[PDB]
Design a protein around this ligand. Structure first.
Ligand SMILES: Nc1nc2sc(CNC3CCN(C[C@@](O)(Cn4cncn4)c4ccc(F)cc4F)CC3)cc2n(-c2ccc3c(c2)N(c2ccccc2)CCO3)c1=O
Ligand SMILES: [Mg+2]
Length: 215
């Protein structure tokens, strides 16, 4: 029930600061990166389930789901992948992301396009192109549901989740969109971006659209 506060490694903190402030033109690539991450998580539970099919019982369906929350200025990206335990969420520290982070910053200084972020293994942080904070809600078969929260500063929190929908298994990124990036709440725009950048994905990409029933 306590909010545990933790500190990012310096390299991650520095990368988030670069990304949240960059004026890069092609911000829509964040969605490709997050879909790719969702797919990779799905691959991992599929791999487990091939050995042990009972691993799917927590959430039998394998999906990626995009849920615009217009009234909240939030975009949710949900998967039924393997998920993250509390210890996984706390351990972006002491992880391959440290290496990816530093190398990627050096590449940026050399002129690399921001769209190369996923080649360094740190495409998760591309969400700060369009969002000023994020909650990562996650449920792994081995642990309870937790929420990790970051505003691109030096600290993050991890809290036992007593306030969100039950995921069953997997991860949901809740992106609090920047005021100039609200185009990513619109059905038409999300479809365009998915079609352009995420043609080859093994799992259904479900878009949740809210429409008024009219006469
Ligand atoms: N939608 C998603 N679902 C998932 S679900 C998952 C499981 N991730 C586990 C990582 C640890 N893994 C252990 C490992 O398997 C790795 N390993 C295998 N061989 C060599 N090493 C292993 C096993 C045994 C052992 F002894 C040592 C080990 F390290 C198991 C999978 C990660 C993940 N991510 C994601 C992808 C991108 C990321 C982050 C998170 N980051 C992030 C982390 C926390 C909070 C916010 C963001 C930051 C960087 O980028 C998703 O967005
Ligand atoms: Mg287990």
């Amino acid at each position: 029930a306590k909010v545990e506060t933790h500190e990012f490694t310096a390299e991650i903190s520095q990368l988030m600061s670069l990304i949240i402030n960059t004026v890069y033109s092609n911000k829509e690539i964040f969605l490709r990166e997050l879909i790719s991450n969702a797919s990779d998580a799905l691959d991992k539970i599929r791999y487990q389930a091939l050995s042990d099919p009972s691993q799917l019982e927590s959430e039998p369906e394998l999906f990626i789901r995009i849920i615009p929350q217009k009234d909240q200025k939030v975009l949710e990206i949900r998967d039924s992948g393997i998920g993250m335990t509390k210890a996984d969420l706390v351990n972006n520290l002491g992880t391959i992301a440290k290496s990816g982070t530093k190398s990627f910053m050096e590449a940026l200084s050399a002129g690399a396009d921001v769209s190369m972020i996923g080649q360094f293994g740190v495409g998760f942080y591309s969400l700060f192109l369009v969002a000023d904070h994020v909650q990562v809600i996650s449920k792994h078969n081995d642990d309870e549901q937790y929420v990790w929260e970051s505003n691109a500063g030096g600290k993050f929190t991890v809290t036992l989740d007593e306030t969100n929908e039950r995921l069953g298994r997997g991860t949901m990124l809740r992106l609090f969109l920047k005021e100039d990036q609200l185009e990513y709440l619109e059905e038409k725009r999300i479809k365009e971006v998915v079609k352009k950048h995420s043609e080859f994905v093994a799992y259904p990409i479900q878009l949740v659209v809210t429409k008024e029933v009219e006469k």
